[PDB]
């Protein structure tokens, strides 16, 4: 788990306090919080069934403390209200964004470039069987739409040629597997551009990394989810409570940053139907009183920790 010591330090859990871990994952951070101070109450949320079941298991060892919840950031306000949690309650809220170890290390879920699997990439697992997969997306969207997703969400300078390769490839055989898609991405580049470039095979610099990241953000609606989750975090924090967020990508970091600065960002309800249908989101992009005390910004890894005290 990322920056566990710093997370627990920034949260500073004390006796009698109440916490929300919005990204329970494998439970790494929640367990570290409990080891620091066990006389707490902690709501453990995740959109992934696999993570939620680990939170339920943990609640069997810590029945006084843990309340496990299955849901998206966008569902968290409803979940908390139905659980009786009032606004202004939490001493701390944690958001460790992105993928869990379970999502990355289970080839069948289709998140990673190491091992081949179905091009699934849905964080919700089997919860929403009609939720579009990454395979659905690359097989259905026209060339301009795919290029826009890669450019906007992946910040992929080569979005057009990669999109062109995807559309050419799918006309031969549908794109259904992660390594199949990675090979298609690499195929967009002439040999002289990539020959003997071992970095383009390395874990975090793989030639298909940005493409996979763009598809993950789109498939899981991560930018709108994040903004909604941050607003919910602020509403349910009490004054003096701490928000701690870990970002790993330029767009989500910019969203957290602007949120903590009190800068307004795009609400979908303010976009015309045409805009919501035909354009990619500008959340986190360059040209899209005091509520916080900003108490930490630290980096390791793409990791960036931002912590703030609600005023
Ligand atoms: C980086 S892992 C968190 C790891 C965790 N802190 C630990 O120690 O194991 C991110 C988790 O947040 C969840 N997640 C990502 N976006 C979400 C969203 N919009 N709503 C609810 N859960 C989300 C993922 O399913 C994943 O389990």
Swiss-Prot record:
Per UniProt, what is the name of the gene that codes for the protein in this document?
Answer: METTL15
Q: Which UniProt keywords apply?
A: Methyltransferase, Mitochondrion, Phosphoprotein, S-adenosyl-L-methionine, Transferase, Transit peptide
* Any Gene Ontology biological process: rRNA base methylation
Q: What's the family?
A: Belongs to the methyltransferase superfamily. RsmH family.
**A molecular function GO annotation:** rRNA (cytosine-N4-)-methyltransferase activity
Q: What is this protein called?
A: 12S rRNA N(4)-cytidine methyltransferase METTL15
- Enzyme class (EC, first level): transferase
The organism is Homo sapiens
Instruction: State the function annotated in the UniProt record.
Output: N4-methylcytidine (m4C) methyltransferase responsible for the methylation of position C839 in mitochondrial 12S rRNA. Involved in the stabilization of 12S rRNA folding, therefore facilitating the assembly of the mitochondrial small ribosomal subunits.
Q: Which GO terms describe its cellular component?
A: mitochondrial matrix; mitochondrion
**Post-translational modification Phosphoserine, affected residues:** 285
Binding residue positions for S-adenosyl-L-methionine? 27-29, 46, 73, 96, 103
Record's catalysed reaction(s): cytidine(839) in 12S rRNA + S-adenosyl-L-methionine = N(4)-methylcytidine(839) in 12S rRNA + S-adenosyl-L-homocysteine + H(+)
**Enzyme Commission identifier(s):** 2.1.1.-
Q: Classify the source by domain of life.
A: Eukaryota
Cell compartment(s), UniProt? Mitochondrion matrix
């Amino acid at each position: 788990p990322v920056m566990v010591d710093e997370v627990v330090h920034c949260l500073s859990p004390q006796k009698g306090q109440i916490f929300l871990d919005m990204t329970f994952g494998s439970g790494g951070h929640t367990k570290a919080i409990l080891q620091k101070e066990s006389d707490i109450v902690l709501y453990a949320l995740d959109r992934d069934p696999t993570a939620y079941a680990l939170a339920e298991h943990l609640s069997e060892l810590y029945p006084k403390q843990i309340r496990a919840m299955l849901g998206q950031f966008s569902q968290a306000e409803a979940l908390l209200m139905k659980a009786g949690v009032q606004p202004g309650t939490f001493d701390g809220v944690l958001m460790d964004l992105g993928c869990s170890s379970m999502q990355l290390d289970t080839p069948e879920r289709g998140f990673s470039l190491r091992k081949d699997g179905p091009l699934d990439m849905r964080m919700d697992g089997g919860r929403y069987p009609d939720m579009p997969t990454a395979a659905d997306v690359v097989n259905a969207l026209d060339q301009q739409a795919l290029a826009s997703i890669l450019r906007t969400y992946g910040e992929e300078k080569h979005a057009k040629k990669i999109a062109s390769a995807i559309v050419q490839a799918r006309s031969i055989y549908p794109i259904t597997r992660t390594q199949q898609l990675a090979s298609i991405v690499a195929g967009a580049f002439p040999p002289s551009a990539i020959y003997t470039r071992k970095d383009l095979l390395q874990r975090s610099t793989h030639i298909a990394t940005k493409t996979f990241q763009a598809l993950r953000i789109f498939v899981n609606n991560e930018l709108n989810e994040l903004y909604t989750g941050l607003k919910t975090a602020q509403k349910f924090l009490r004054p003096g409570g701490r928000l701690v967020a870990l970002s790993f990508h330029s767009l989500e970091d910019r969203i957290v940053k602007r949120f903590l600065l009190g800068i307004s960002m795009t609400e979908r309800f303010n976009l015309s139907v045409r805009q919501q249908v035909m354009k990619t989101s500008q959340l986190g992009s360059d040209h899209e009183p005091l509520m916080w005390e900003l108490i930490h910004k630290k980096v390791l890894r793409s990791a960036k920790l931002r912590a703030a005290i609600k005023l």
